[PDB]
């Protein structure tokens, strides 16, 4: 399967380098603008502000790894060592699953604000949103920890080793883990956003829009960008239970920067929470 190995090498060296390079540029400019916009324009933060700021810190953590990942793919090997293998492997998964969770909590915030504009409920308080943000980081750190435990079992001390559980290790355990992570990390938050879109539509039908705009954009962005990646990560593991195996790995490679395009386009949500932040940004 020499031809498929040529495709794998080209996809890593040229496709991943270019796609991650573009995401690094668009992501850094977008996230620094919305972060400095909050640091210099927002005086009194609400729940949605807290979640959006966390989403940007999550994006920026991922964007900071990209020069190392692009340099590794461009040279064909991992040379940064064991500490940087674990920190990079953590940040990539953590950015993926914290991002959909921050958007799920923003969606519930927009729904409660639609019913109770004055934010009287404890669930609608800024201090509670800070607690939920800390909960999101702890939950996602825990979801990602079995992958890190597997990585510490491999010979990372060699300095040039940094395995992907989709491609290495027991396929039976990797599949159970990857399917549980697809369910808890992707499908469950996506369903919760779908449920709250439906609750919003029912509320507005009874009373008979901006709240619908943010939730619909979140459901569309995550359905389109996370679905090919989640299908291929699971198909890559299942195929390990040949040329078919290398072809599936090439399809899997293609889907990875497509899922992380999320971190470059996420700053758009800053402009969908009704505060006229775009107008506030131009004034400064």
């Amino acid at each position: 399967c020499e031809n498929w190995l040529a495709l794998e090498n080209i996809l890593e060296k040229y496709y991943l380098s270019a796609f991650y390079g573009i995401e690094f540029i668009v992501g850094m400019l977008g996230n620094f603008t919305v972060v400095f916009g909050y640091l210099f324009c927002m005086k009194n933060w609400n729940s949605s502000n807290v979640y959006l700021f966390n989403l940007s810190i999550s994006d920026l953590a991922f964007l900071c790894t990209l020069p190392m990942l692009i340099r590794s793919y461009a040279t064909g090997n991992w040379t940064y060592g064991d500490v940087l293998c674990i920190s990079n492997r953590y940040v990539l998964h953590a950015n993926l699953y914290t991002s959909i969770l921050f958007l799920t909590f923003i969606s519930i915030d927009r729904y409660l604000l639609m019913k109770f504009p004055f934010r009287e409920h404890i669930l609608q308080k800024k201090e509670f949103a800070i607690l939920i943000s800390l909960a999101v980081w702890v939950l996602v750190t825990l979801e990602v920890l079995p992958m890190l435990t597997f990585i510490t079992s491999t010979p990372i001390e060699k300095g040039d080793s940094c395995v992907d559980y989709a491609s290495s290790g027991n396929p039976k355990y990797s599949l159970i883990y990857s399917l549980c992570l697809t369910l808890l990390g992707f499908l469950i938050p996506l369903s919760v956003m779908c449920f709250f879109y439906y609750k919003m539509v029912v509320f507005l039908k009874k009373r008979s829009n901006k709240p619908l705009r943010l939730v619909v954009l979140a459901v569309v962005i995550f359905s389109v960008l996370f679905t090919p990646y989640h299908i291929m990560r699971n198909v890559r593991i299942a195929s390990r239970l040949g040329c078919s195996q290398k072809a599936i790995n090439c399809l899997y490679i293609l889907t990875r920067p497509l899922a992380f395009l999320n971190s470059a386009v996420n700053p758009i949500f800053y402009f969908l929470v009704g505060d006229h932040f775009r107008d506030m940004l131009f004034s400064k």
Partner: nanobody, 127 residues
Framework: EVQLVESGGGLVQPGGSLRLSCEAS???????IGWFRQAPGKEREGVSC???????VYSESVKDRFTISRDNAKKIVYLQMNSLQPEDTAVYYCAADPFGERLCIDPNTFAGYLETWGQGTQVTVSS
């Protein structure tokens, strides 16, 4: 470019009614007007809000008792307060948002972005 003045503050017996006015000097058509109140030792809280389109919102504590209305021709916003109780004793203020459809989405957060406020009017509910 608008200036606000609240008026109508007075002494009400528990269960009594009172109407406040928020009068503007400057057009008011494109402004959202929210009513806020501050009791001694407590934080400021929104009570009622009217968008430039005419949509009204009420806090849960005043929902069954207050009515907000506007007269763009006279540039006045009224707050009819029915069934007032000692716990409603506070200085009532009105604020104006030039983004007419913004304020009433999240009055307690979006009030913080506003430069146009009145001086406040004292409402005292005591037996």
């Amino acid at each position: 470019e608008v200036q606000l003045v609240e008026s109508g503050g007075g002494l009400v017996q528990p269960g009594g009614s009172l109407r406040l006015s928020c009068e503007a000097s400057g057009t008011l058509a494109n402004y959202a007007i929210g009513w806020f109140r501050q009791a001694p030792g407590k934080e400021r809280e929104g009570v009622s809000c009217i968008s430039s389109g005419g949509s009204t919102v009420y806090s849960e504590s005043v929902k069954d008792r207050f009515t907000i209305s506007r007269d763009n021709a006279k540039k006045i916003v009224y707050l009819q307060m029915n069934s007032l109780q000692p716990e409603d004793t506070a200085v009532y203020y009105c604020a104006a948002d030039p983004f007419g459809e913004r304020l009433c989405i999240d009055p307690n957060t979006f009030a913080g972005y506003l430069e146009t406020w009145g001086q406040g009017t004292q409402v005292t509910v005591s037996s």
